[PDB]
Amino acid sequence: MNLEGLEMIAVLIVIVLFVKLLEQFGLIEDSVEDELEMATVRHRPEALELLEAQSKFTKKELQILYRGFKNECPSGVVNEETFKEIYSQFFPQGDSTTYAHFLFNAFDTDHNGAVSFEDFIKGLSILLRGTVQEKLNWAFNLYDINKDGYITKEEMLDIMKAIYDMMGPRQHVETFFQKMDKNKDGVVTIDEFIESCQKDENIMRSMQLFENVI
Q: Which residues bind Ca ion (CB under 5 A)?
A: 144, 146, 148, 150, 155, 181, 183, 185, 187
How far is C-alpha 207 from the chain's CA centre?
12
**How near is the Cβ of 48 to Ca ion at its closest, in Å?**
36
Is the CB of 148 or the CB of 201 nearer to Ca ion? 148
Q: Rounded CA gap, 160 and 6, in Å?
A: 28
* Residue 77 burial (C-beta neighbours within 10 Å; 0-12, 13-18, 19+): exposed
Q: Which residues pair with 152 in a beta bridge?
A: 187
Q: Which of 69, 142, 155 has the alpha carbon at shortest distance from 108?
A: 142
**How near is the Cβ of 187 to Ca ion at its closest, in Å?**
5
Q: Do the annotations mark residue 150 as ligand-binding? A: yes
What is the number of other CB atoms lying within 10 angstroms of the CB of residue 170?
Answer: 9
Is the CB of 11 or the CB of 180 nearer to Ca ion? 180
Is the CB of 48 or the CB of 187 nearer to Ca ion? 187
Is the CB of 119 or the CB of 192 nearer to Ca ion? 192
Q: Do the annotations mark residue 108 as ligand-binding? A: yes
Q: Do the annotations mark residue 165 as ligand-binding? A: no
Q: Rounded CA gap, 57 and 213, in Å?
A: 10
The helix/strand/coil state of 12 is helix
**How near is the Cβ of 74 to Ca ion at its closest, in Å?**
29
Known binding-site residue numbers: 108, 110, 112, 119, 144, 146, 148, 150, 155, 181, 183, 185, 192
Known binding-site residue numbers for Ca(2+): 108, 110, 112, 119, 144, 146, 148, 150, 155, 181, 183, 185, 192
